[PDB]
Amino acid sequence: AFDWDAYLEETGSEAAPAKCFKQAQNPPNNDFKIGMKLEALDPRNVTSTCIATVVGVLGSRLRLRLDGSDSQNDFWRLVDSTEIHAIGHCEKNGGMLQPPLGFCMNASSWPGYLCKILNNAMVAPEEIFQPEPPEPEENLFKVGQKLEAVDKKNPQLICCATVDAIKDDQIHVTFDGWRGAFDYWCNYRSRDIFPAGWCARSCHPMQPPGHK
């Protein structure tokens, strides 16, 4: 459990206030179980919705993998993400499920495929999907502030970070003790940033600053 209060005091810093983030005041409960199927936006083509399977769970996050694709392109979504839904959601809304971009068969094999994987499949019930957190209506971050952030190159990891710079609705996230190579800009609404303490409150491991 990372001693944020010690760290803030030794670096002379403020943590960014909770009202800055689009995250629930309390981490949402994660009732998902590994093997459950659900519907998610294909990160490699965000216009497609695809069947995904929970392959890991960590704090309030799911590690998802799209059925019929590959094991090298897993992605993580919070249980209260608006990019995952219960199965049947897409269709109820006038949509069609799509094969993943990395689908391992040929396309005409897709309709048959959906049937086989949906047959007696373990499916996440709709009630375990958490509601979308209220959002701030402007950027309240400020240069200097510290926070917890997913490292988009190794997303299993959430790490101690700092806001470096601001241009309107974008913040620039830096990772303390790492070479600015893991830095990124993101919208203040991003679901990949959290107030200091969030990880401990949700049982997600939280990386201390790097050793550089």
Rounded CA separation 81/155 (Å): 15
Whether 108 and 193 share a structural domain? no
CA 145: distance to chain centroid? Answer: 21
Q: Which of residues 97, 131, 165 is at a domain's end?
A: 131
Whether 124 and 148 share a structural domain? no
CA dihedral sign, ordered 115, 120, 125, 128: negative
Q: In what order do the strands lie in the sheet with 75-78?
A: 75-78, 61-66, 45-58, 37-42, 84-85
Whether 59 and 92 share a structural domain? yes
If one counts every other C-beta atom within 10 angstroms of the C-beta of residue 88, the result is 12
Whether 39 and 126 share a structural domain? yes
59: left (phi over 0), alpha (psi -120 to 50) or beta: left
Whether 150 and 181 share a structural domain? yes
Whether 8 and 57 share a structural domain? no
**Hey, which bits of 121-204 come out as E strands?**
146-150, 158-167, 170-175, 184-187, 193-194
User: What's the token pair of residue 11?
Assistant: 């670096």
Whether 187 and 152 share a structural domain? yes
Whether 95 and 37 share a structural domain? yes
DSSP H stretches of helix in the chain: 4-10, 89-92, 110-118, 198-202
Q: What is the CATH number of the domain that holds 66?
A: 2.30.30.140
Is there a contact between 60 and 28 (Cβ–Cβ < 8 Å)?
A: yes
H or E stretch including 55?
strand 45-58
Residues in the chain after which the chain is broken, C→N over 2.5 Å: none
Whether 2 and 77 share a structural domain? no
Rounded CA separation 97/48 (Å): 7
Query: What is the count of structural domains for the chain?
Result: 2
Whole domain around residue 138: which residue ranges?
1-27+132-212
Rounded CA separation 66/43 (Å): 10
CA 86: distance to chain centroid? Answer: 17
Whether 38 and 126 share a structural domain? yes
Whether 64 and 125 share a structural domain? yes
Whether 44 and 114 share a structural domain? yes
> For residue 150, which of 25, 41, 21, 30 has the smallest C-alpha distance?
21
Q: Which of residues 131, 161, 180 is at a domain's end?
A: 131
Resolution in A, one decimal? 2.7
